[PDB]
Curated annotation (Swiss-Prot), chain B:
Keywords: Amyloid, Amyloidosis, Cytoplasm, Disease variant, Gamma-carboxyglutamic acid, Glycoprotein, Hormone, Neuropathy, Phosphoprotein, Secreted, Signal, Sulfation, Thyroid hormone, Transport
Localization: Secreted; Cytoplasm
Key word Phosphoprotein present: yes
Organism domain of life: Eukaryota
Keyword presence, Phosphoprotein: yes
Protein name: Transthyretin
Any further remark recorded for this protein: Tetramer dissociation and partial unfolding leads to the formation of aggregates and amyloid fibrils. Small molecules that occupy at least one of the thyroid hormone binding sites stabilize the tetramer, and thereby stabilize the native state and protect against misfolding and the formation of amyloid fibrils.
Result, substituting A82S: In AMYLD1; amyloid polyneuropathy
Principal localisation: secreted
Residues represented out of the complete protein: 30 to 145 of 147
Family membership: Belongs to the transthyretin family.
Species of the source: Homo sapiens (Human)
Outcome recorded upon mutating F24L: In AMYLD1; amyloid polyneuropathy
From Swiss-Prot, chains C, D:
Protein name per its UniProtKB record: Transthyretin
Effect of S44P: In AMYLD1; amyloid polyneuropathy
Family the UniProt entry places it in: Belongs to the transthyretin family.
Tissue distribution of the protein: Detected in serum and cerebrospinal fluid (at protein level). Highly expressed in choroid plexus epithelial cells. Detected in retina pigment epithelium and liver.
Effect of F25V: In AMYLD1; amyloid polyneuropathy
Subcellular compartments: Secreted; Cytoplasm
Chain ranges passing through the membrane: none
Sites of Sulfocysteine modification: C2
Gene symbol of the encoding locus: TTR
Effect of L50H: In AMYLD1; amyloid polyneuropathy
Disease tied to this entry: Amyloidosis, hereditary systemic 1: A form of hereditary systemic amyloidosis, a disorder characterized by amyloid deposition in multiple tissues resulting in a wide clinical spectrum. AMYLD1 is an autosomal dominant form due to transthyretin amyloid deposition. Protein fibrils can form in different tissues leading to amyloid polyneuropathies, amyloidotic cardiomyopathy, carpal tunnel syndrome, systemic senile amyloidosis. The disease includes leptomeningeal amyloidosis that is characterized by primary involvement of the central nervous system. Hyperthyroxinemia, dystransthyretinemic: A condition characterized by elevation of total and free thyroxine in healthy, euthyroid persons without detectable binding protein abnormalities.
Range within the parent protein: 29 to 145 of 147
Amino acid sequence: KCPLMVKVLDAVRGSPAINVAVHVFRKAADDTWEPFASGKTSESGELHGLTTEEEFVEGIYKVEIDTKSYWKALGISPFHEHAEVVFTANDSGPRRYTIAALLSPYSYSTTAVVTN
Amino acid sequence: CPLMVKVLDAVRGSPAINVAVHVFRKAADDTWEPFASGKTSESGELHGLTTEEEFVEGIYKVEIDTKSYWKALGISPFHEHAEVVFTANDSGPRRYTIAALLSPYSYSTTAVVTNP
Amino acid sequence: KCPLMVKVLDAVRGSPAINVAVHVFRKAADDTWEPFASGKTSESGELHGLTTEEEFVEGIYKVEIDTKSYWKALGISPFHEHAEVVFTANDSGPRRYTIAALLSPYSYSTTAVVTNP
Amino acid sequence: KCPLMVKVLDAVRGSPAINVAVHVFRKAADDTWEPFASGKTSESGELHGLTTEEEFVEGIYKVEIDTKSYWKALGISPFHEHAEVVFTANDSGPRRYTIAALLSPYSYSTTAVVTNP
Protein backbone atom coordinates (compact mmCIF):
# COMPACT_ATOMS: atom_id res chain seq x y z
CA LYS A 1 0.00 0.00 0.00
CA CYS A 2 3.09 2.19 -0.16
CA PRO A 3 2.59 5.12 -2.56
CA LEU A 4 6.26 5.00 -3.63
CA MET A 5 8.42 1.88 -3.88
CA VAL A 6 11.88 1.54 -5.43
CA LYS A 7 13.15 -1.68 -7.02
CA VAL A 8 16.82 -2.08 -7.95
CA LEU A 9 18.30 -4.93 -10.01
CA ASP A 10 21.87 -5.98 -10.77
CA ALA A 11 22.43 -6.77 -14.45
CA VAL A 12 25.91 -8.22 -13.85
CA ARG A 13 24.98 -10.81 -11.21
CA GLY A 14 21.32 -11.29 -12.15
CA SER A 15 20.15 -10.81 -8.57
CA PRO A 16 18.32 -8.03 -6.72
CA ALA A 17 20.57 -5.21 -5.57
CA ILE A 18 20.72 -5.56 -1.78
CA ASN A 19 21.36 -2.70 0.66
CA VAL A 20 21.30 0.19 -1.81
CA ALA A 21 20.96 3.70 -0.40
CA VAL A 22 17.90 5.52 -1.75
CA HIS A 23 17.17 9.19 -1.06
CA VAL A 24 13.95 10.98 -2.00
CA PHE A 25 13.78 14.77 -2.31
CA ARG A 26 10.99 17.25 -2.98
CA LYS A 27 11.40 20.47 -4.93
CA ALA A 28 10.92 23.54 -2.75
CA ALA A 29 9.36 26.88 -3.66
CA ASP A 30 12.84 28.34 -4.32
CA ASP A 31 13.78 25.50 -6.72
CA THR A 32 15.79 23.68 -4.04
CA TRP A 33 15.74 20.00 -3.10
CA GLU A 34 14.70 19.26 0.47
CA PRO A 35 15.04 15.81 2.09
CA PHE A 36 11.80 13.83 2.01
CA ALA A 37 12.53 10.15 2.71
CA SER A 38 15.39 7.68 2.86
CA GLY A 39 16.12 4.01 3.27
CA LYS A 40 18.02 0.98 2.04
CA THR A 41 16.82 -1.87 -0.16
CA SER A 42 16.02 -5.13 1.62
CA GLU A 43 17.15 -8.63 0.64
CA SER A 44 14.38 -8.60 -1.99
CA GLY A 45 16.00 -5.62 -3.71
CA GLU A 46 13.04 -3.33 -3.02
CA LEU A 47 12.45 -0.54 -0.51
CA HIS A 48 9.07 -0.34 1.23
CA GLY A 49 7.65 2.14 3.71
CA LEU A 50 9.47 5.17 2.34
CA THR A 51 6.45 7.41 2.87
CA THR A 52 2.71 7.32 3.51
CA GLU A 53 -0.04 8.78 1.35
CA GLU A 54 -0.46 11.65 3.83
CA GLU A 55 3.10 12.90 3.29
CA PHE A 56 3.25 12.04 -0.43
CA VAL A 57 1.66 15.26 -1.65
CA GLU A 58 1.74 16.62 -5.21
CA GLY A 59 5.16 17.89 -6.22
CA ILE A 60 8.31 17.29 -8.23
CA TYR A 61 10.27 14.46 -6.63
CA LYS A 62 13.86 13.29 -7.04
CA VAL A 63 14.62 9.63 -6.32
CA GLU A 64 18.40 9.44 -5.86
CA ILE A 65 19.88 5.93 -5.97
CA ASP A 66 23.43 5.61 -4.63
CA THR A 67 24.76 3.33 -7.33
CA LYS A 68 28.36 4.49 -6.84
CA SER A 69 28.54 3.12 -3.29
CA TYR A 70 26.87 -0.13 -4.36
CA TRP A 71 29.36 -0.78 -7.16
CA LYS A 72 32.31 0.29 -5.00
CA ALA A 73 31.23 -2.17 -2.30
CA LEU A 74 31.61 -4.89 -4.97
CA GLY A 75 35.06 -3.71 -6.05
CA ILE A 76 33.77 -2.27 -9.33
CA SER A 77 34.54 1.25 -10.53
CA PRO A 78 31.34 2.69 -12.04
CA PHE A 79 30.75 5.60 -14.43
CA HIS A 80 27.79 7.43 -12.89
CA GLU A 81 28.10 9.23 -9.57
CA HIS A 82 24.47 8.23 -9.01
CA ALA A 83 21.35 7.24 -10.91
CA GLU A 84 18.51 9.62 -10.10
CA VAL A 85 15.00 10.06 -11.49
CA VAL A 86 13.18 13.40 -11.50
CA PHE A 87 9.43 13.17 -11.99
CA THR A 88 6.18 14.92 -11.12
CA ALA A 89 4.03 12.87 -8.76
CA ASN A 90 0.30 13.01 -8.01
CA ASP A 91 -0.31 15.64 -10.69
CA SER A 92 -3.91 14.42 -11.21
CA GLY A 93 -4.99 12.36 -8.22
CA PRO A 94 -2.97 10.15 -5.87
CA ARG A 95 -1.15 7.33 -7.64
CA ARG A 96 1.19 4.53 -6.58
CA TYR A 97 4.65 4.88 -8.14
CA THR A 98 7.18 2.10 -8.66
CA ILE A 99 10.69 3.12 -9.72
CA ALA A 100 12.52 0.15 -11.24
CA ALA A 101 16.23 0.52 -11.98
CA LEU A 102 18.46 -1.95 -13.82
CA LEU A 103 22.09 -1.29 -12.96
CA SER A 104 25.30 -1.87 -14.89
CA PRO A 105 28.72 -0.35 -14.13
CA TYR A 106 28.66 1.90 -17.21
CA SER A 107 24.95 2.04 -18.05
CA TYR A 108 21.60 1.94 -16.34
CA SER A 109 17.96 1.61 -17.31
CA THR A 110 15.07 3.01 -15.31
CA THR A 111 11.35 2.53 -15.85
CA ALA A 112 8.24 3.65 -13.99
CA VAL A 113 5.08 1.71 -13.20
CA VAL A 114 2.21 4.05 -12.30
CA THR A 115 -1.12 2.67 -11.11
CA ASN A 116 -4.21 3.72 -9.15
CA CYS B 1 7.20 -22.04 -9.31
CA PRO B 2 10.78 -22.34 -10.59
CA LEU B 3 10.24 -20.28 -13.78
CA MET B 4 8.49 -16.91 -13.87
CA VAL B 5 8.09 -14.35 -16.64
CA LYS B 6 7.47 -10.64 -16.07
CA VAL B 7 6.77 -8.20 -18.90
CA LEU B 8 6.76 -4.40 -18.67
CA ASP B 9 5.76 -1.75 -21.20
CA ALA B 10 8.11 1.23 -21.51
CA VAL B 11 5.62 3.37 -23.47
CA ARG B 12 2.58 3.38 -21.17
CA GLY B 13 4.38 2.87 -17.85
CA SER B 14 2.41 -0.23 -16.93
CA PRO B 15 2.78 -4.02 -16.93
CA ALA B 16 2.10 -5.74 -20.24
CA ILE B 17 -1.07 -7.83 -19.92
CA ASN B 18 -2.19 -10.86 -21.94
CA VAL B 19 1.21 -11.25 -23.60
CA ALA B 20 1.71 -14.68 -25.16
CA VAL B 21 4.74 -16.52 -23.79
CA HIS B 22 5.97 -19.84 -25.19
CA VAL B 23 8.69 -21.97 -23.60
CA PHE B 24 10.64 -24.48 -25.68
CA ARG B 25 13.30 -27.06 -24.90
CA LYS B 26 16.02 -27.94 -27.39
CA ALA B 27 15.73 -31.63 -28.27
CA ALA B 28 18.40 -34.13 -29.31
CA ASP B 29 18.11 -33.10 -32.99
CA ASP B 30 18.47 -29.35 -32.28
CA THR B 31 14.68 -28.94 -32.42
CA TRP B 32 12.55 -26.79 -30.13
CA GLU B 33 9.85 -28.99 -28.67
CA PRO B 34 7.02 -27.26 -26.80
CA PHE B 35 7.43 -27.22 -23.03
CA ALA B 36 5.04 -24.64 -21.55
CA SER B 37 2.89 -21.70 -22.57
CA GLY B 38 0.69 -19.02 -21.08
CA LYS B 39 -0.23 -15.35 -20.97
CA THR B 40 0.88 -12.71 -18.50
CA SER B 41 -1.66 -11.80 -15.84
CA GLU B 42 -2.97 -8.36 -14.85
CA SER B 43 0.37 -7.72 -13.11
CA GLY B 44 2.34 -8.76 -16.18
CA GLU B 45 3.48 -12.00 -14.57
CA LEU B 46 3.27 -15.63 -15.70
CA HIS B 47 2.96 -18.02 -12.75
CA GLY B 48 3.04 -21.79 -12.57
CA LEU B 49 4.69 -22.46 -15.92
CA THR B 50 6.23 -25.69 -14.65
CA THR B 51 7.27 -27.63 -11.55
CA GLU B 52 10.78 -28.43 -10.38
CA GLU B 53 10.16 -32.14 -11.00
CA GLU B 54 9.54 -31.68 -14.74
CA PHE B 55 11.76 -28.58 -15.10
CA VAL B 56 14.75 -30.73 -16.03
CA GLU B 57 18.13 -29.36 -17.10
CA GLY B 58 18.42 -28.16 -20.67
CA ILE B 59 18.46 -25.24 -23.06
CA TYR B 60 15.19 -23.30 -22.82
CA LYS B 61 13.84 -20.64 -25.17
CA VAL B 62 11.28 -18.12 -23.90
CA GLU B 63 9.51 -16.39 -26.78
CA ILE B 64 7.68 -13.20 -25.82
CA ASP B 65 5.32 -12.52 -28.73
CA THR B 66 5.70 -8.75 -28.76
CA LYS B 67 4.39 -8.11 -32.28
CA SER B 68 0.86 -9.22 -31.39
CA TYR B 69 1.05 -7.03 -28.28
CA TRP B 70 1.77 -3.91 -30.34
CA LYS B 71 -0.75 -4.67 -33.12
CA ALA B 72 -3.55 -4.83 -30.53
CA LEU B 73 -2.56 -1.27 -29.53
CA GLY B 74 -2.35 0.19 -33.04
CA ILE B 75 1.47 0.32 -33.26
CA SER B 76 3.53 -1.30 -36.01
CA PRO B 77 6.60 -2.76 -34.25
CA PHE B 78 10.05 -3.69 -35.53
CA HIS B 79 10.90 -7.10 -34.07
CA GLU B 80 8.78 -10.05 -35.12
CA HIS B 81 9.09 -11.29 -31.51
CA ALA B 82 11.41 -11.17 -28.51
CA GLU B 83 13.19 -14.44 -27.75
CA VAL B 84 15.33 -15.29 -24.71
CA VAL B 85 17.42 -18.46 -24.92
CA PHE B 86 19.23 -19.75 -21.84
CA THR B 87 20.53 -22.88 -20.13
CA ALA B 88 18.53 -23.82 -17.03
CA ASN B 89 19.36 -26.03 -14.03
CA ASP B 90 22.86 -26.79 -15.30
CA SER B 91 24.38 -26.85 -11.79
CA GLY B 92 21.41 -27.72 -9.61
CA PRO B 93 17.80 -26.57 -9.39
CA ARG B 94 17.26 -22.81 -9.45
CA ARG B 95 14.42 -20.30 -9.62
CA TYR B 96 14.36 -18.19 -12.79
CA THR B 97 12.65 -14.85 -13.37
CA ILE B 98 12.61 -13.56 -16.95
CA ALA B 99 11.90 -9.82 -17.07
CA ALA B 100 11.36 -7.90 -20.31
CA LEU B 101 10.83 -4.20 -21.01
CA LEU B 102 9.18 -3.48 -24.35
CA SER B 103 9.30 -0.54 -26.76
CA PRO B 104 8.02 -0.54 -30.36
CA TYR B 105 11.54 -0.51 -31.82
CA SER B 106 13.56 -1.69 -28.81
CA TYR B 107 13.43 -4.04 -25.87
CA SER B 108 15.54 -5.10 -22.91
CA THR B 109 15.48 -8.39 -21.03
CA THR B 110 16.99 -9.35 -17.68
CA ALA B 111 17.09 -12.49 -15.55
CA VAL B 112 17.04 -13.08 -11.79
CA VAL B 113 18.34 -16.45 -10.57
CA THR B 114 17.92 -17.37 -6.90
CA ASN B 115 19.13 -20.53 -5.18
CA PRO B 116 16.26 -22.14 -3.19
CA LYS C 1 25.26 3.01 -48.51
CA CYS C 2 24.82 -0.48 -47.09
CA PRO C 3 21.16 -1.15 -46.15
CA LEU C 4 21.99 -3.36 -43.14
CA MET C 5 24.35 -2.37 -40.32
CA VAL C 6 25.03 -3.99 -36.95
CA LYS C 7 26.43 -2.03 -34.00
CA VAL C 8 27.19 -3.66 -30.65
CA LEU C 9 28.04 -1.97 -27.34
CA ASP C 10 29.29 -3.25 -23.98
CA ALA C 11 27.43 -2.00 -20.90
CA VAL C 12 30.06 -3.24 -18.42
CA ARG C 13 33.28 -1.70 -19.75
CA GLY C 14 31.53 1.21 -21.47
CA SER C 15 33.19 0.45 -24.80
CA PRO C 16 32.25 -0.91 -28.23
CA ALA C 17 32.09 -4.70 -28.39
CA ILE C 18 34.81 -5.89 -30.76
CA ASN C 19 35.04 -9.14 -32.77
CA VAL C 20 31.48 -10.17 -31.95
CA ALA C 21 30.15 -12.86 -34.27
CA VAL C 22 27.03 -11.71 -36.13
CA HIS C 23 25.07 -14.17 -38.29
CA VAL C 24 22.25 -13.04 -40.58
CA PHE C 25 19.67 -15.63 -41.63
CA ARG C 26 16.80 -15.24 -44.07
CA LYS C 27 13.50 -17.08 -43.66
CA ALA C 28 12.63 -19.40 -46.54
CA ALA C 29 9.23 -20.51 -47.84
CA ASP C 30 9.36 -23.68 -45.69
CA ASP C 31 9.73 -21.83 -42.36
CA THR C 32 13.46 -22.43 -41.94
CA TRP C 33 16.35 -19.99 -41.68
CA GLU C 34 18.94 -20.09 -44.44
CA PRO C 35 22.25 -18.20 -44.20
CA PHE C 36 22.32 -14.79 -45.85
CA ALA C 37 25.33 -12.89 -44.48
CA SER C 38 27.90 -13.10 -41.71
CA GLY C 39 30.72 -11.10 -40.18
CA LYS C 40 32.34 -9.76 -37.05
CA THR C 41 31.99 -6.26 -35.63
CA SER C 42 34.97 -4.01 -36.29
CA GLU C 43 37.15 -2.11 -33.81
CA SER C 44 34.30 0.42 -33.48
CA GLY C 45 31.83 -2.40 -32.81
CA GLU C 46 30.22 -2.00 -36.23
CA LEU C 47 29.49 -4.30 -39.17
CA HIS C 48 29.20 -2.73 -42.63
CA GLY C 49 29.17 -4.25 -46.10
CA LEU C 50 26.93 -7.14 -45.08
CA THR C 51 25.32 -7.31 -48.53
CA THR C 52 24.08 -5.15 -51.41
CA GLU C 53 20.81 -3.26 -51.76
CA GLU C 54 19.48 -5.44 -54.59
CA GLU C 55 20.42 -8.69 -52.82
CA PHE C 56 18.77 -7.37 -49.64
CA VAL C 57 15.14 -8.04 -50.57
CA GLU C 58 11.79 -8.15 -48.80
CA GLY C 59 11.47 -10.92 -46.24
CA ILE C 60 11.91 -11.91 -42.61
CA TYR C 61 15.51 -11.71 -41.44
CA LYS C 62 17.17 -13.02 -38.28
CA VAL C 63 20.27 -11.37 -36.80
CA GLU C 64 21.96 -13.51 -34.16
CA ILE C 65 24.56 -11.86 -31.95
CA ASP C 66 26.73 -14.55 -30.36
CA THR C 67 26.93 -12.91 -26.95
CA LYS C 68 27.91 -16.08 -25.08
CA SER C 69 31.25 -16.34 -26.89
CA TYR C 70 31.84 -12.65 -26.17
CA TRP C 71 31.32 -13.11 -22.42
CA LYS C 72 33.26 -16.38 -22.20
CA ALA C 73 36.30 -14.72 -23.78
CA LEU C 74 35.99 -11.93 -21.20
CA GLY C 75 35.88 -14.56 -18.45
CA ILE C 76 32.24 -13.96 -17.46
CA SER C 77 29.57 -16.65 -17.37
CA PRO C 78 26.50 -15.17 -19.07
CA PHE C 79 22.80 -16.03 -18.93
CA HIS C 80 21.75 -15.88 -22.59
CA GLU C 81 22.97 -18.30 -25.24
CA HIS C 82 22.76 -15.51 -27.82
CA ALA C 83 20.91 -12.32 -28.69
CA GLU C 84 18.78 -13.00 -31.76
CA VAL C 85 16.83 -10.25 -33.52
CA VAL C 86 14.09 -11.22 -35.98
CA PHE C 87 12.38 -8.56 -38.07
CA THR C 88 10.58 -7.98 -41.37
CA ALA C 89 12.74 -5.97 -43.77
CA ASN C 90 11.77 -3.93 -46.83
CA ASP C 91 8.05 -4.38 -46.22
CA SER C 92 7.11 -1.15 -48.04
CA GLY C 93 10.23 -0.07 -49.90
CA PRO C 94 14.03 -0.17 -49.68
CA ARG C 95 15.12 0.95 -46.21
CA ARG C 96 18.48 1.14 -44.45
CA TYR C 97 18.55 -0.85 -41.21
CA THR C 98 20.92 -0.32 -38.29
CA ILE C 99 20.77 -2.89 -35.48
CA ALA C 100 22.20 -1.63 -32.18
CA ALA C 101 22.69 -3.88 -29.15
CA LEU C 102 23.78 -3.10 -25.58
CA LEU C 103 25.16 -6.09 -23.69
CA SER C 104 25.34 -7.00 -20.00
CA PRO C 105 26.22 -10.41 -18.52
CA TYR C 106 22.65 -11.12 -17.39
CA SER C 107 20.74 -8.62 -19.54
CA TYR C 108 20.80 -6.93 -22.92
CA SER C 109 18.92 -4.28 -24.86
CA THR C 110 18.57 -3.88 -28.62
CA THR C 111 17.23 -1.08 -30.79
CA ALA C 112 16.78 -0.38 -34.49
CA VAL C 113 17.33 2.74 -36.60
CA VAL C 114 15.41 2.75 -39.89
CA THR C 115 15.85 5.49 -42.49
CA ASN C 116 14.53 6.07 -46.00
CA PRO C 117 17.19 6.79 -48.69
CA LYS D 1 37.05 14.89 -32.85
CA CYS D 2 35.41 16.37 -29.75
CA PRO D 3 36.03 15.31 -26.13
CA LEU D 4 32.27 15.24 -25.46
CA MET D 5 29.50 13.92 -27.71
CA VAL D 6 25.85 13.14 -27.08
CA LYS D 7 23.84 10.55 -29.00
CA VAL D 8 20.09 10.46 -28.49
CA LEU D 9 17.83 7.77 -29.93
CA ASP D 10 14.06 7.31 -29.94
CA ALA D 11 12.81 3.78 -29.36
CA VAL D 12 9.17 4.60 -30.16
CA ARG D 13 9.68 5.49 -33.84
CA GLY D 14 13.12 3.97 -34.40
CA SER D 15 14.74 7.18 -35.65
CA PRO D 16 17.25 9.61 -34.14
CA ALA D 17 15.86 12.26 -31.83
CA ILE D 18 16.18 15.57 -33.69
CA ASN D 19 16.61 18.96 -31.99
CA VAL D 20 16.85 17.69 -28.42
CA ALA D 21 18.10 20.19 -25.85
CA VAL D 22 21.29 19.03 -24.11
CA HIS D 23 22.74 21.00 -21.20
CA VAL D 24 26.15 20.38 -19.63
CA PHE D 25 26.98 21.57 -16.12
CA ARG D 26 30.12 21.55 -14.00
CA LYS D 27 30.06 21.30 -10.22
CA ALA D 28 31.39 24.42 -8.52
CA ALA D 29 33.52 24.47 -5.38
CA ASP D 30 30.38 25.17 -3.31
CA ASP D 31 28.57 22.05 -4.63
CA THR D 32 26.54 24.04 -7.15
CA TRP D 33 26.07 23.49 -10.88
CA GLU D 34 27.41 26.16 -13.24
CA PRO D 35 26.51 26.27 -16.95
CA PHE D 36 29.15 24.74 -19.20
CA ALA D 37 27.67 24.10 -22.66
CA SER D 38 24.42 23.58 -24.53
CA GLY D 39 23.12 22.72 -27.96
CA LYS D 40 20.63 20.77 -30.04
CA THR D 41 20.85 17.38 -31.72
CA SER D 42 21.75 17.30 -35.41
CA GLU D 43 20.02 15.25 -38.11
CA SER D 44 21.88 12.17 -36.83
CA GLY D 45 21.04 12.90 -33.18
CA GLU D 46 24.59 13.96 -32.32
CA LEU D 47 26.21 16.92 -30.58
CA HIS D 48 29.53 18.21 -31.90
CA GLY D 49 31.60 21.26 -31.06
CA LEU D 50 29.97 21.31 -27.63
CA THR D 51 33.42 21.68 -26.04
CA THR D 52 37.09 21.16 -26.82
CA GLU D 53 39.94 19.64 -24.84
CA GLU D 54 41.22 22.61 -22.86
CA GLU D 55 37.81 23.82 -21.64
CA PHE D 56 36.80 20.25 -20.79
CA VAL D 57 38.78 19.91 -17.57
CA GLU D 58 38.68 17.43 -14.69
CA GLY D 59 35.54 17.64 -12.59
CA ILE D 60 32.05 16.34 -11.96
CA TYR D 61 29.79 17.04 -14.93
CA LYS D 62 26.03 16.80 -15.38
CA VAL D 63 24.60 16.12 -18.84
CA GLU D 64 20.91 17.06 -18.82
CA ILE D 65 18.87 15.82 -21.78
CA ASP D 66 15.57 17.72 -21.97
CA THR D 67 13.42 14.74 -22.85
CA LYS D 68 10.21 16.32 -21.54
CA SER D 69 10.16 19.05 -24.20
CA TYR D 70 10.95 16.49 -26.91
CA TRP D 71 7.97 14.30 -26.02
CA LYS D 72 5.58 17.27 -25.77
CA ALA D 73 6.49 18.33 -29.32
CA LEU D 74 5.41 14.82 -30.37
CA GLY D 75 2.11 14.98 -28.50
CA ILE D 76 3.37 12.56 -25.84
CA SER D 77 3.22 13.18 -22.09
CA PRO D 78 6.35 11.62 -20.55
CA PHE D 79 7.27 10.53 -17.02
CA HIS D 80 10.75 11.91 -16.35
CA GLU D 81 11.30 15.65 -16.24
CA HIS D 82 14.63 15.02 -17.99
CA ALA D 83 17.32 12.40 -18.53
CA GLU D 84 20.08 13.34 -16.14
CA VAL D 85 23.59 11.85 -16.11
CA VAL D 86 26.21 12.74 -13.48
CA PHE D 87 29.77 11.55 -13.95
CA THR D 88 33.38 12.42 -13.25
CA ALA D 89 35.50 13.23 -16.30
CA ASN D 90 39.25 13.26 -16.94
CA ASP D 91 40.10 12.06 -13.44
CA SER D 92 43.09 10.17 -14.90
CA GLY D 93 43.89 12.15 -18.03
CA PRO D 94 41.82 13.42 -20.95
CA ARG D 95 39.25 11.04 -22.41
CA ARG D 96 36.66 11.14 -25.18
CA TYR D 97 33.18 10.68 -23.72
CA THR D 98 30.08 9.66 -25.67
CA ILE D 99 26.76 9.77 -23.82
CA ALA D 100 24.13 7.63 -25.53
CA ALA D 101 20.50 7.76 -24.43
CA LEU D 102 17.57 5.64 -25.62
CA LEU D 103 14.32 7.41 -24.79
CA SER D 104 10.85 6.02 -24.17
CA PRO D 105 7.94 8.01 -22.72
CA TYR D 106 8.05 6.17 -19.38
CA SER D 107 11.58 4.74 -19.42
CA TYR D 108 15.07 5.54 -20.61
CA SER D 109 18.40 3.77 -20.73
CA THR D 110 21.70 5.62 -20.90
CA THR D 111 25.19 4.31 -21.61
CA ALA D 112 28.65 5.82 -21.86
CA VAL D 113 31.37 5.03 -24.40
CA VAL D 114 34.68 6.23 -22.96
CA THR D 115 37.69 6.03 -25.28
CA ASN D 116 41.36 6.85 -24.74
CA PRO D 117 42.88 9.07 -27.49
